[PDB]
Design a protein around this ligand. Sequence first.
Ligand SMILES: [Fe+3]
Ligand SMILES: [Fe+3]
Ligand SMILES: [Fe+3]
Ligand SMILES: [Fe+3]
Lengths: 200, 200, 200, 200, 238, 238, 238
Amino acid sequence: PIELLPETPSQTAGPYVHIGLALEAAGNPTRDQEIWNRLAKPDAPGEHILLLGQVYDGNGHLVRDSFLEVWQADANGEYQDAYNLENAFNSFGRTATTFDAGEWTLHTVKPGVVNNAAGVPMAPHINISLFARGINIHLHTRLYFDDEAQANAKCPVLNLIEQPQRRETLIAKRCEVDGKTAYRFDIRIQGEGETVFFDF
Amino acid sequence: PIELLPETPSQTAGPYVHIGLALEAAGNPTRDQEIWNRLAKPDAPGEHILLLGQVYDGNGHLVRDSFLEVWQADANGEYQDAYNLENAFNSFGRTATTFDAGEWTLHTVKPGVVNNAAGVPMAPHINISLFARGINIHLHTRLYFDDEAQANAKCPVLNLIEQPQRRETLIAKRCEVDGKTAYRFDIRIQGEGETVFFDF
Amino acid sequence: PIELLPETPSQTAGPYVHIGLALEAAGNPTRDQEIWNRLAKPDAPGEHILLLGQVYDGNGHLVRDSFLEVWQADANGEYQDAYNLENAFNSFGRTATTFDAGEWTLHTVKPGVVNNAAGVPMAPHINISLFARGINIHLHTRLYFDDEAQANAKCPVLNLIEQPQRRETLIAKRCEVDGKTAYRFDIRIQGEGETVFFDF
Amino acid sequence: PIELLPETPSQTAGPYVHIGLALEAAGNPTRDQEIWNRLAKPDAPGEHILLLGQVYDGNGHLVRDSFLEVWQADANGEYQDAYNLENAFNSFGRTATTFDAGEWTLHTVKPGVVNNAAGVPMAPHINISLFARGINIHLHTRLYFDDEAQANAKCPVLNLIEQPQRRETLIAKRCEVDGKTAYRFDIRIQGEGETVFFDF
Amino acid sequence: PAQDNSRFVIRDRNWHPKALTPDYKTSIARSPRQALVSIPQSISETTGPNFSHLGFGAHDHDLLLNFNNGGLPIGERIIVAGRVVDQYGKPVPNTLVEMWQANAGGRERHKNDRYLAPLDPNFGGVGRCLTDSDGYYSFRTIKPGPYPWRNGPNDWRPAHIHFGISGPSIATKLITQLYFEGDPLIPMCPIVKSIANPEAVQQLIAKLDMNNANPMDCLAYRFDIVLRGQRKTHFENC
Amino acid sequence: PAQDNSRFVIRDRNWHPKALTPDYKTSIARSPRQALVSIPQSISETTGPNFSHLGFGAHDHDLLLNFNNGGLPIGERIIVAGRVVDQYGKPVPNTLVEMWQANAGGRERHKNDRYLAPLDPNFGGVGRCLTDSDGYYSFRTIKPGPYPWRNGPNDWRPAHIHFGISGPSIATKLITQLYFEGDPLIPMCPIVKSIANPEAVQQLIAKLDMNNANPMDCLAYRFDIVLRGQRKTHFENC
Amino acid sequence: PAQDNSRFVIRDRNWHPKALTPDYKTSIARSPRQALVSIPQSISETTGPNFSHLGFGAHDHDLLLNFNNGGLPIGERIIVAGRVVDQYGKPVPNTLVEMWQANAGGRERHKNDRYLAPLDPNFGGVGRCLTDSDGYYSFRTIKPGPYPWRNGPNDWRPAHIHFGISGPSIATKLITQLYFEGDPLIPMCPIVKSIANPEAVQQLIAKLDMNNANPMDCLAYRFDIVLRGQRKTHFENC
Ligand SMILES: [Fe+3]
Ligand SMILES: [Fe+3]
Ligand SMILES: [Fe+3]
Ligand SMILES: [Fe+3]
């Protein structure tokens, strides 16, 4: 068969992943421009939301050294690839769970509807990539919302998961933190209530 | 040492095992003579029973594409090997679980007692072979009855299972389906309350 | 692929092929029972014919050391395999061209119609096998008759030969030798007017 | 020595070359634009001629499945490489012989004079490429005209053929088909009067 | 009735595929975590059904004619033949050989198969044959095409025919898959790779049989099946 | 008009098949007995047609849609793609690549083909594509099936697609055949064996391309074509 | 009468010697220039003569006694024995095996043989034997000597015995030559070299059989003959 050049193999992000990718969370001095958890500036269009969650291992214990990267569409359902800190909204962002804060936070807007390759509408989602010590190659997942039940039942990607009980793990529960709209999304890497991870 | 010709390796029966071994269950037209779940005709000697069950995977979910083959003796404790659809009783039968019916059914009589190689009597049993997608080589098990407690405690095969809590998984619970004598035999392939599988 | 045992390779019959297969033609004493050119005894059913011909090489010169074997059906279109010198007709016979007689002779009856594998009628034919020095592996040919033009135009084997001009080489011309019905069949191994040779 | 990448090996065009390169001749429906035998439209400059011929194998039999490609200059001696069906003249064309029509036809104009690499004028010619079953790698030849005797005797390509009797095979005989100027060019692939084939 | 007079050679479970083979995804949740319990052979295990008296139709083995809605199937006409022997080389006569496959495009005749390749109105994909006195079987069908499945993002099953063989007992019963010679998809399939030993993968590859082919008609493939060795009981119960 | 500015590398006629190859029967009467006459390259040989302005239809390269009588063809959906380069590795842009094949069963859409395998009412078997700026071409079709032919008593052609490539000149023009990876019929075919060198047979074998495959849809094959090397004229006529 | 129930494996014409082998001079004018026409097997080709009822003399297989004019032949007393099987390994019973050879000096009993080595008054050189139930034949003769022939200026034929085997049909009918183990003239003979494959030459070589030799009497040679494989018809005419 036709063999291409092999891809450079993955290695764990390591315990001290924060010194290079999350400088403030690592208690080290920052540079002028950093890629962090504030995707939307207070004046950006759409419904402003606060995302929070914890990451658990197979023994039900907190992963206090995880690193997460997010990729989502804007309120109109468009992906803004040109990253600039002067933009009202950026489609990319980074967050982490530390020893001081075992809970990650993300400030963004609720994403609009985007279509798949076949032209069929996908439910509002946020693409997540999980890195940490013990994770040799990053885990890919999606975050869906509980107040969008009608679109979640018709999503082509969510309907690919055979068992309905496993679809529930990708659904973030709505709550309120200080008068601001918030969604809680816990990731269970292994065991009971294990989060669905993707390959693409 | 002495090496013989190697046995042809096993492969999974696949998700569509029904098109070749359960034509009716596959929604396709049947041939004149088929091998199915009716082991005994109404005028056959012995106690007429109905067997039913569900197959579960390691996550507690139903296996809707399982295929089962049964081998049992008659009421007089004899194995009828000459398969014919004109016979009042046949020792062989096939059943399955479909997406439409996630529960398999088998119409037969309660088997008689048969002796092992050493002349010691075995408790009334039905030999089952389980095939499905995800199962590389078929699983062997035995179905015992709960109302035969005295014979089950003396069975030389059941006593080979070290732990008594694992013997209970091979015991079918007596119930009634539409005012007819029935026994329920659920198979748990993996996990909590895992069914004992044999090798011979 | 599947490989079977290889067939023993062919070698030329050699210049002195007559000492072992045509004893009388070799001027050597014969044994009690010999396989020769008299297929039909004077009292056998059907139209009694005399076949004669010469064999030419690529330079138009006579092959005076050829050996031929024939196989034909009887007047009713049946192959008589049980060779016996007491039979009125035998389906097998042998002939040769010598230095004393550069022309071969054969005394037989005209064959009846036999069907091919598909049930389609073949025209009256005689299967010939040619052996000689210089011929490494024997040549297979068929002899057809000129007075059976209607059947020759419809024969499945004769119609397999692409060019109509090459079909004429397998057709023996009718003549008369001393009041007896005779057909002349010349074989041209190479060159102008080359005889069609078969593979099967 | 210096070795370059090897050229992809040639294979026979096969008996059914017509389904991909002569759709009309194959009795199949044609596409909007096809490459066929009409090189010149009625209002094209130069002397309008009709070319025809038959292709013969080594046994003197007609090759009814031949496929021919032609390349010629216009009346002014120039090669029109930009193929378009709207043009009055195209330097390229394709023709064939079918079972229905064992004779190929080509409608074009008489080509003008073109110079070789050394500036010496070549006689009016048409470059032909012959493809068919049995022909492993295509045969190259040239068509010259009999009424151009003075230019043919001086042609630097025709003078490379050692024997003058072999040059006559490349010369098309002038005749008339339906009161129109025509030239007959028969190709003999093998044997007596074999056509000169080129290598370049 | 059937008697306890035979013993079968113990299965080499390191030759056969293992239950847990991660790359074949569905095997993760459908494999036992507890060990298989070994039991001696008895009349329940050493006996099995005999299908000599089963009413076989005339075209049960011929997939080119057993569905027939007024025509012939589109695809490479092939004959699949071979012999059913045990580990000692002894033939297994009067045994049931069952088979099922996809059409020339990889589409299977089942409601759950939603692959975009069309169904062939003259092809069913089911076959059965009883082996003769010398253990030989024969099927006439079309060569199945490969098909994709939801395992990895670009996983493709090689062209295959699923086989089911009964044997003299339930101890010999086997379901397997036949693969075709030279198919480049064979070393890539995770179901094939469930078998650890490379020499075992070779036993599943049907070889091109030009000798069994019908000239100007159909090609042929040879597939020999080896079942568990059968021997007589000796020195038992002293 | 076209000009005489290029020279083409001379063909290696011991790499390419010979005219007289006895096992391929029809080649006996259709091969020259006299030697080919060598002539220098001129404007007649170094120039050729350019098909950039030819009116290509939207589905000319797509054999899954270019015949369409109300459906999809039965067979293994495949993509046949590759690059057209010369002997120096230089791409050949805007060149005509033509192709023709049989259906999934080995039946060709021609009146003279009387093979018993049925015709596919949704498959024609003809394709054309013009290479892009980088010399790439692409076709979408079904994988053709093998077929028998009257040569030897049991001769079978391997699954193949016939190719026709124009190039920058009539000197580069080539007609060839593509074969598929691992096909056991390749070392047995007398048309393939017309080529003496085994390394040359390998250049005709299309390799399985999983990287160019469309997941859950169609497989892919890679076939690179190498034409005669083109170089500029130097030190001619002194 | 004979019936059409058998099919024979097609001959490998690249294993067998070709028709045109120039080093064997007489083959140049006695070989067809046109290709052989392939035809399907019918009753005319799949049937053949059976010689069970032919009246064999008591010494027909014994070349030491079948000529007899007063004594024994001069030469190495040998037994030539073997088995006639088909390509499947199945024995060919009640078949006709005919043989002819030269005397100990290379002189054949024919008028055209004017070689200066004398004739043996007690040797003829002809033998015939019908194979038994298991396909075995046996001949008792003297080892033939080499002889020269007008081909090249110094060509010598190795020591050989010509063999003629009938088989179940005219399709299996074969004439060949047996050679002796270790004879240094074998690789130098142009008739032997008519066979291209060196592994094919090996099948024609008789091996010394000390096990089948009679102590204090005669040596023995083994020569097994393999005829075209016979199989029953299947899936014909549908
Ligand atoms: Fe580190
Ligand atoms: Fe399958
Ligand atoms: Fe000799
Ligand atoms: Fe073709």
